[PDB]
Amino acid sequence: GNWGDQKKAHQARAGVSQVLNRLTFASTLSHLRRLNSPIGRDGKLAKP
DNA sequence: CAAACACACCAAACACAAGAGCTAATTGACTGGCCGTTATCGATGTATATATCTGACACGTGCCTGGAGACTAGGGAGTAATCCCCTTGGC
């Protein structure tokens, strides 16, 4: 899932590729059609 | 003019970002030099297989010696008569 080179993996993004959650058809669909913002996790701001 | 401290500004870092609880899955180093084992290539044979030449045995052909065949020449071996020497026989 590290969208970058192996040597500098930590410098690249994380979670870009995830394991498809095959727990129930609805979950599969939701997963295949999901988004994710690059903003840092748990940011103090609340506009985004 | 040089030195004391004070203020405003600029530049440089520190540490924090609730309590946790469960589950899943990606990473399982790598060229090179060198020593140490071992596999392979090579020589240096001696053992066995096959080919050439020599020796002994076998079948076959042969040159040579002696033997054998037909025919001949002509004389050696050989009937038929004869003599009478000599032997066997006698008193």
Side-chain angles (χ1 to χ4, degrees), chain A residues 1-21:
Chain A
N2 302 340
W3 211 256
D5 303 67
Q6 180 170 358
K7 295 182 178 180
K8 54 177 182 183
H10 59 276
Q11 302 182 357
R13 291 71 167 181
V16 176
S17 173
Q18 299 175 349
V19 182
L20 176 52
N21 178 96

Side-chain angles (χ1 to χ4, degrees), chain A residues 2-41:
Chain A
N2 302 340
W3 211 256
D5 303 67
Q6 180 170 358
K7 295 182 178 180
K8 54 177 182 183
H10 59 276
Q11 302 182 357
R13 291 71 167 181
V16 176
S17 173
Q18 299 175 349
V19 182
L20 176 52
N21 178 96
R22 308 298 295 272
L23 184 55
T24 186
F25 199 89
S27 55
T28 300
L29 291 174
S30 66
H31 204 157
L32 292 169
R33 302 178 73 265
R34 182 172 296 182
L35 283 66
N36 173 16
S37 187
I39 186 63
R41 309 294 83 172

